[PDB]
Amino acid sequence: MDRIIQSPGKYIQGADVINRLGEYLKPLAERWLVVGDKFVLGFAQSTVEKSFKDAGLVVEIAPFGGECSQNEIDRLRGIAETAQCGAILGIGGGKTLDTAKALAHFMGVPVAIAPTIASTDAPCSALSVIYTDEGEFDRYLLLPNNPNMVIVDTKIVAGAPARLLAAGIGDALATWFEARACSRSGATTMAGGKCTQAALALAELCYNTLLEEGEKAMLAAEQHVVTPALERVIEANTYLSGVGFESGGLAAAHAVHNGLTAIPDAHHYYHGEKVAFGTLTQLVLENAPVEEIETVAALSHAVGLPITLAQLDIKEDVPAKMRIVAEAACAEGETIHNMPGGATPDQVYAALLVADQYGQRFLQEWE
Amino acid sequence: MDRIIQSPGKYIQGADVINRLGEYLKPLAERWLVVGDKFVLGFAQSTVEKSFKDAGLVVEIAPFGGECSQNEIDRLRGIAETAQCGAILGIGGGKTLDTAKALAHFMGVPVAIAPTIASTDAPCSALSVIYTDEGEFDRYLLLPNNPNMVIVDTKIVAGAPARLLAAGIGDALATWFEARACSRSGATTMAGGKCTQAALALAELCYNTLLEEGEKAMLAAEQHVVTPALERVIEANTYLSGVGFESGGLAAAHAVHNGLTAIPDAHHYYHGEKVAFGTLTQLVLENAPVEEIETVAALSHAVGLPITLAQLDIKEDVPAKMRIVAEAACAEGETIHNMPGGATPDQVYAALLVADQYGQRFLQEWE
Amino acid sequence: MDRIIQSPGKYIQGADVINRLGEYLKPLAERWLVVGDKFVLGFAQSTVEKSFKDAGLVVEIAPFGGECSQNEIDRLRGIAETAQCGAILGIGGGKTLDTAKALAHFMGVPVAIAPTIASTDAPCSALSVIYTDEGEFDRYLLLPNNPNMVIVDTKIVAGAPARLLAAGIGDALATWFEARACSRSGATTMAGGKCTQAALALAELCYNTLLEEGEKAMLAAEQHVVTPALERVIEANTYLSGVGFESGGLAAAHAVHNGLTAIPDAHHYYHGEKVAFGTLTQLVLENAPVEEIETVAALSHAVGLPITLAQLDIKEDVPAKMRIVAEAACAEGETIHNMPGGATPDQVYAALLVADQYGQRFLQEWE
Amino acid sequence: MDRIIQSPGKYIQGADVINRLGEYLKPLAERWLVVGDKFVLGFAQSTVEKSFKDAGLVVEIAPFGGECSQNEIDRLRGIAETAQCGAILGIGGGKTLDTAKALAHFMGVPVAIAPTIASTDAPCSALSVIYTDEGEFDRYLLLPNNPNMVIVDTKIVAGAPARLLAAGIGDALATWFEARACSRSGATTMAGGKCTQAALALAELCYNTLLEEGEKAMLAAEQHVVTPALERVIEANTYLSGVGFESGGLAAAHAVHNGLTAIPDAHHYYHGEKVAFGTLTQLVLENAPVEEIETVAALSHAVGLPITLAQLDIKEDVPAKMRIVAEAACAEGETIHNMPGGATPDQVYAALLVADQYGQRFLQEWE
Ligand SMILES: [Cl-]
Ligand SMILES: [Zn+2]
Ligand SMILES: [Zn+2]
Ligand SMILES: [Zn+2]
Ligand SMILES: [Zn+2]
Ligand SMILES: [Zn+2]
């Protein structure tokens, strides 16, 4: 099979980089649609407009409905054709960014993505998740290519709630272990081939960056300031983790995340916070060595990620609920089948309970 | 400053991947111009055509004149506009690929790049070098983005003379040392910012891939067969080295290469062969440890790359010529100024003579 | 002297392997006597019968008396002769399996052994422990060969009380230290020769498997689920430990176990729980380094095995009782004479008291 | 699936152990057929007769036709039924032993196997290779169980030509690399399951034994004397390698051996001599690190095994012949499909030529 790696065309990261959006985006189009929800436009709209003006570009700002629905994409398509936009610039969190990527696809124009948080590794990916106007799952829209540009303002991200950075860390912490599993098993990545040497290097670089920089970065995030450690974790949460997961492979950790949403208890927890426990479950499933499990559990704990089912508010019908999680994780077409032996629901069920036990014993020892 | 990494959107590599050109390219355009190297088309045109047809695409094959001149670009522009092509596919050596990238830029269409040799790391880069019809240098054409897709057929590459693989190795062997030098000095990369963690990991991965796989890969190249060592060295010569140099930084090795072209003696040697000696000169200039010089020298010699001036046919007015090489390498806007502390023409002159001296003594131990 | 290793002809292990007894045993005989106690036949008879039926085999269920006595073997010999059995299948715990192996010997037929717990390393051995009709130890019965097949259902073993897995770990934890002692001293194994390289490799693998997988396997055991760590400790408790002790050697640890049954206080503790303290006694006796004593004590404690006399309910009049244990351990024909240099009852006495002190100081250091 | 390891019931090796056949074999049967090569009986028949007689056993000597054909098995079956033999003892080389094992199977009696050379790992296996009277291949006879006893007289083996010990080393050297390959890919062993930990430990112990003991053992082999190093290599060549391959897995090395017999040039070379080059081919195919390739090539050369096609007298029309070898090695039901990711005939062809290059380069350097 072919070895494939895909990447956004340009990834840019720096403090106060929105001031420089105009010069960065000019080579792609002269007239831009700028999609942002009201909260994000609150602090950035002044700066976006100034940057485009000084650069000689025309901007047409369109406040974002808040949900990534086919209706909202169609709605913005109208405004954009009316204002004769040559590209879309999405700015904000995950759903606002997915909307920009889907819109720019249907219109056949380039897209720029400016995350205002580093809480998932979705931004750089060639994937948009579409919902109905009212918020239920609808379809996956796999896109022909990754965002043309990704611009991350590290000062904006430092301003966000620290819990969102740690959720991002939890998301990126799975990257290495799922890419490694797909390499061991010969699985196909979401880029359509086997692992390049490049993708595995970026996946492992992700994990080591979190080990070396996570706690230092959280200190900065809690103070809402920018230090070089925060810079590195943002790159790891965003570019490394994005290319890592998409061109390196997904496996049990994310299948387990999907299983955890198939029950209501953990609705109030972020994507990356569920993956955190998914990674620990995968380590039990593949029987990672004790030193590796402890390292992942310690790092997760150090940044506030859950390492037990109770810390995801799953406290009541635990056997019954884990049986649902396990069946969901092993559903047809789920990525847990990329694990080396494959995985049966009985096996995933076992890992779920054991990972939970392991986390409980860890919390009572380390404090 | 901002940290920037740029990449082609999708990099694909595999044996006989030419059979799959059609499916890989369909998501980009329905109508394709193929700028093709005459030797490549000689044996492959039927196969390219069948690949496009089976995918439901219409293709217009255009044999390439051999030089990347404004005349040749204009001539191909006509053919493409007549045939109403939405994208350009270059397939062949460096000049074919540079022509496809320039053509696609002037037309404002996506471009796909299919190297049939792995002798430089230019294919993935956002740069095209334009000449006059008779091969004299004319100008640089910096492109706003990297090729949309790069597709490398390893079986086609294995057919080329092994000297071309080794030239590629010499080109890629410099990557780590120049990106590392730029990181030490805070220099700006060709992507316009400081180096990301990602680019440095790919640059160092490149170097280690060459150390571990170069001699094994050369064995396969000399038999024109495909082994996993060859696959990895092709990825290093192409994706790792391209992203490494462009987003990691250039320094003395390439500057010394340019200086070596300021004299006639080594005109008949490939780019990567002159870079090979540039890397040894940089190692003297930055006073790399002796183990490191020895490792780079041993690997270079093991794959037939020059490690002395005489092996580039520089045998006569060596001081006078090295004086020219040094002055040229230190010209304004040359990348030697990215070395920590910079480099004066007197310092580069000394490094040249000492590296040559070091290479000669290494050869005398018949290694 | 000759180097000899003995092994069962086939060892099979898996989840729900009970379903596959028929196809696994078909090549050995067509008509099978199945020996099982009422409790085991309770949950397993239905499944065994279906497995034999579907495979084209004849089964004869023979409920087991509960004691491995000469008279009980003779009784089953009669039942077997009547039903014209070509093979024996024992399926309960230890006494069931010993009875099946001896019966098959006197009958001159193959035997398959299906343990439903992994709590001792006897299953694979060419040995049956014989009692009187009223339950007193009578003699060891050496068999000419090891069981023809051993089939371990990992799901059945996961269902059993976790305390039994820990006893199995305690039993298997001694294997490396006693085989290593016999190798150092040149002692003869129960297989009749000196150590093969093979048996020493399997004994040390056993120890390292417990070291790496013991705590992970106990988490799965306490939840009655199957994880790859549990799979590994089952193989270690059963095959590795079995071939290790029989073809690797016994020494002080088992001598001390036998001595510990020469007093009533520890009647309520399993074989492996007493062996666990025997291993610590041997480590004091052979003056292992403190790192080795501590590693064994920590692993023992981490899975709930005793590392003090008090944890074997030996709390009253300890000096007098240890004298009896020591004298018993040094009886004629005991394996403590395999220690390098032998051991006197005074020496074993001192080792017992000091090992007890060591365990106590360890428990006082906060678990 | 299931973890399965199969083994002979008892493996014995020692100097002059044929003196002790009687006491070792008596517990299995009272009346023995001894199948023996005329040359082997030449020096051994008197000693065998005394050993069985002194032990109270009855023996019936049956000189062996030399070929393991159904006609010859039937001829010996007759003699055995007439003399009312309860078990078979084969004593000689490979054909004698395969004949004894098949005969014992058809008769449903135990078999004892006494190799007089240690040149393959077949003796301990549950497999017999049947030919026609005139030496052309007929069928494989998979046996329900491994030999009951294997007895290796190390002094008899020391008397054999040293080339045969080296052939045994070449055969045993592949064990680790093929078992490791099957473990990486989850292939099924010839024992019907996935790898036990035990079998991988024996396969790796085999490899390390050859590295540490191979050259010392060859010194003793050339003087026809017994040293502890020779004993360890015999155990490695016989028990470790046998259990390793059958319960650990076969892969490219043996597929490549089979392909090499598909051409006439190497008819005068022993099984293990061809396997030696098969291992090197596998190392190229799976892209083993150079240190590993060099270690295997160096050890192979140190004991006289071939590391080039010319050393197997394959010197003419080499590409044409290697294409035959490659196609044969990938035929349906060959073990090359156990390699991670499989291997196509083109990939094996490439490995063959490159491994040949590597061997040639090694011979002219490290001679
Ligand atoms: Cl035309
Ligand atoms: Zn995620
Ligand atoms: Zn270059
Ligand atoms: Zn050049
Ligand atoms: Zn025991
Ligand atoms: Zn073999």
Curated annotation (Swiss-Prot), chains A, B, C, D:
Give, as in the UniProt entry, the pathway in which the protein acts: Polyol metabolism; glycerol fermentation; glycerone phosphate from glycerol (oxidative route): step 1/2
Which portions of this protein are annotated as coiled-coil regions?
A: none
Enumerate the catalysed reactions: glycerol + NAD(+) = dihydroxyacetone + NADH + H(+); hydroxyacetone + NADH + H(+) = (S)-propane-1,2-diol + NAD(+); (R)-1-aminopropan-2-ol + NAD(+) = aminoacetone + NADH + H(+)
Cofactor binding notes: Binds 1 zinc ion per subunit.
Q: What induces it?
A: Full expression of gldA is achieved by induction with hydroxyacetone and stationary-phase growth conditions.
- The UniProt record gives the binding positions of glycerol as D121, H254
- Gene Ontology process terms (BP): anaerobic glycerol catabolic process; methylglyoxal catabolic process; protein homotetramerization
EC numbers, comma separated: 1.1.1.6, 1.1.1.75
Its GO CC terms? Answer: cytosol; protein-containing complex
**Which NCBIfam families does the entry link to?**
PRK09423.1
Would you tell me the protein name for this molecule?
Answer: Glycerol dehydrogenase
Taxonomic source organism: Escherichia coli (strain K12)
**What does UniProt list as this organism's lineage?**
Bacteria, Pseudomonadati, Pseudomonadota, Gammaproteobacteria, Enterobacterales
